Amino acid sequence: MAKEEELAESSAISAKEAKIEDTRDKIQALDESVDELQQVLLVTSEELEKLEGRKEVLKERKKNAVQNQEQLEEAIVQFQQKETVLKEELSKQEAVFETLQAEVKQLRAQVKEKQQLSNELTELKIAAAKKEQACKGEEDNLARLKKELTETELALKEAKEDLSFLTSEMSSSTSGEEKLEEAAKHKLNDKTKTIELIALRRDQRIKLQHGLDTYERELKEMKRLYKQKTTLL
């Protein structure tokens, strides 16, 4: 009977040796659970800096577009500036044509008016073509002066060219900004939260791995005192 409950004490060794084999299977459930999470974190991390890179593309396209937008606004201002001058000048030079042919009609008449000697009236005939020719070209020069306004006013419709260009830097970016900045900030929270699971689960297992440190040593004596007493009797 004395030994009958010597071994009935060794039954607890089976409990501890079972609590071990039950506990080591509690840790590895998490050393691959974590492993599954580290393969998720890998994926989540890839999407962010792919997205964060895609966000950098529009920054290259606009800052290249801004150099194209501010450039055309200069042209838009420069062309309207020339157009205001040419249309003023053409009108100003058109006035010379008006004053031109007003002097020529009086010239032919006045020289003929005195004629109603004659050489002094033909001295106006010389003054006729003198006034006529000096103001014949100005009637034709301002005509071609309008041709520079036939190029500028149309160039102002190459300013509309910027707006058409711009809306492809907007609705391609604005539809892209809601496609990038919405997702890029949203893809991050999944990344950080996955790291927090791992950090906890790793800490959750080290508390059992420290539990295992005690449990695995307690057996070495349980199996020694029993072994040293088994050699006694």
Curated annotation (Swiss-Prot):
It is found in: Cytoplasm. Disruption phenotype: Mutants produce anucleate cells and show defects in nucleoid structure and in chromosome partitioning. The lineage of its organism: Bacteria, Bacillati, Bacillota, Bacilli, Bacillales. Contains large globular domains required for ATP hydrolysis at each terminus and a third globular domain forming a flexible SMC hinge near the middle of the molecule. These domains are separated by coiled-coil structures. Residues 202-233 form a coiled coil. Required for chromosome condensation and partitioning. The chain holds residues 250 to 924 of 1186 of the full protein. This is Chromosome partition protein Smc. It comes from the Bacteria. Homodimer. Belongs to the SMC family.
